[PDB]
């Protein structure tokens, strides 16, 4: 997984982004986008992975939400927008060590990724009041899983860590920066007292009196409680520098495989959402470490990259401020390999979800947009420079699209006596043209790959 963080005063419009890459250990898994309305929430929770077993609230708020179509291993909403224009994004896998694990190992039926969206979103009505409920119910549960979690609102962005199987700290990001982080922790300096900042009670105890801290002065959070591992290198680091060289070229160093690259990051510009999915997306682009590029084959592996074969999701949650509460907030959402698909700003404010985006099965079917999408991603791979510039022609006139029909349907919010009706119409007219322009793109690939097949023999006249 992949995240990007950006404050109010960072974004081009005045909104919060909290973004994510869902990337699983498959290369597919089918998702779902789903409205939970209250009606349909458990007050009795128990996960398949863990059997962690968590009593709920009666008063669960409507929620977005990304759930695994195979519930094998439980539901996995990934991330959503409340009733209450509070985002929430779990997880983001980080990294641990061996003496903080010593001190509060794991918990084997505690809570997971699985399950941390459903416990913790529907019941809060601040990211401050998410970071504080995550906190909470740690420490009653436990947790068998090292995770970064984030949290906004129409104010704030919230950055969440958990530490050792009941340990937590938290960040709140300067509303001018923005946050790139990878699958390891990413906290690094850290004021206990600041107005930004909230964690276990007793964790600067916990750090005094087991002699955690390396440091000789302060406190770095991932320095205490984290890795700076060689594997750290090749598989987190460069996705970190890579997008901080896209966001604040004049502030980062050659280096993609420094160990204290800054978590919090002031951009030489306001950041746009085409911004986010492009990172988002990435392959270390007009480097050597470019999968599809020019560099040797030791080089073309080495790193991790950012747009992966197993994005299972990709979700950008928006909480706008330039628009009435009822339409901002926002989930931008795609499925399969990032290369070849684009975000779509469905509005939040919605009991039910676009056909193309709610119904895939186990089942493979071309009319549902995980599978469209993942085959496209697939087939593009097969001849990147090929491709790409259709890819491009596409990703352009697409978002061109989305735009019109929000600036459209904002535009005319004024009045409407059913909103939710108002907006899911609003995002039927968005997934209808999504699926009508990923199809034509992959048509466009099928027809003039079909004629770069190496089954083939032309006649030149």
């Not at 204290?260 to 492009?278: T, Y």
């Not at 599978?371 to 697939?378: G, I, K, M, Q, V």
Request: a negative charge; hydrophobic letters at 35%; glycine letters at 6%.
């Amino acid at each position: 997984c992949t995240s990007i963080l950006v404050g109010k005063k960072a974004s081009i419009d005045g909104s919060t982004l909290i973004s994510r890459n869902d990337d699983g250990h498959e290369a597919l898994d089918p998702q779902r986008f789903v409205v939970v309305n209250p009606e349909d929430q458990p007050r009795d929770y128990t996960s398949v992975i863990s059997k962690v077993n968590v009593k709920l609230p009666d008063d669960p708020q409507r929620y977005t939400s990304i759930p695994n179509s195979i519930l094998t291993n439980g539901i996995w909403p990934a991330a959503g927008i409340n009733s209450s224009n509070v985002a929430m994004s779990a997880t983001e896998t980080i990294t641990t060590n061996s003496r903080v694990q010593g001190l509060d190992p794991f918990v084997e039926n505690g809570l997971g990724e699985e399950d941390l969206v459903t416990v913790v979103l529907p019941y809060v009505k601040s990211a401050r009041e998410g970071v504080k409920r995550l906190g909470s119910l740690l420490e009653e549960y436990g947790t068998y899983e090292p995770n970064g979690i984030s949290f906004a609102d129409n104010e704030e962005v919230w950055w969440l860590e958990t530490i050792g199987g009941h340990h937590w700290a938290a960040v709140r990001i300067p509303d001018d920066a923005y946050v790139v982080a990878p699958n390891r922790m990413n906290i690094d300096q850290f004021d206990f007292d600041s107005d930004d900042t909230l964690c276990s009670s007793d964790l600067k105890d916990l750090i005094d009196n087991n002699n955690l801290n390396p440091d000789f002065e302060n406190y770095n959070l991932r320095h205490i409680f984290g890795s700076a591992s060689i594997k750290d290198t090749v598989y987190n680091n460069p996705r970190t520098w890579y997008g901080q060289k896209f966001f604040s070229p004049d502030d980062t160093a050659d280096d993609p495989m420094e160990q204290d690259l800054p978590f919090i990051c002031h951009a030489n510009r306001k950041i746009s959402v085409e911004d986010v999915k492009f990172v988002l997306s990435s392959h270390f682009e007009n480097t050597k470490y470019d999968v599809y590029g020019s560099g040797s084959q030791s080089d073309k592996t080495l790193f991790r990259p950012i747009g992966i074969n197993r994005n299972h999701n990709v979700h950008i949650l928006q909480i706008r401020n330039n628009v009435p509460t009822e339409i901002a907030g926002i989930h931008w959402l795609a499925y399969g390999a990032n290369t070849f698909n684009t975000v779509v700003p469905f509005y939040a404010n919605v009991n039910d979800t676009p056909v193309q985006y709610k119904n895939a099965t186990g089942k493979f079917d071309l009319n549902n947009m995980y599978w469209l999408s993942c085959t496209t991603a697939l087939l593009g791979d097969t001849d990147y420079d090929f491709y790409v510039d259709m890819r491009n022609d596409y990703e352009l006139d697409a978002m061109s699209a989305y735009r019109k029909i929000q600036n459209d349907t904002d535009a005319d919010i004024s009045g409407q006596k059913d909103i939710e009706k108002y907006l899911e119409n609003a995002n039927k007219k968005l997934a209808d043209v999504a699926f009508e322009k990923q199809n034509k793109l992959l048509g466009d690939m099928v027809t003039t790959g079909s004629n770069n097949m190496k089954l083939r023999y032309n006649l030149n006249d």
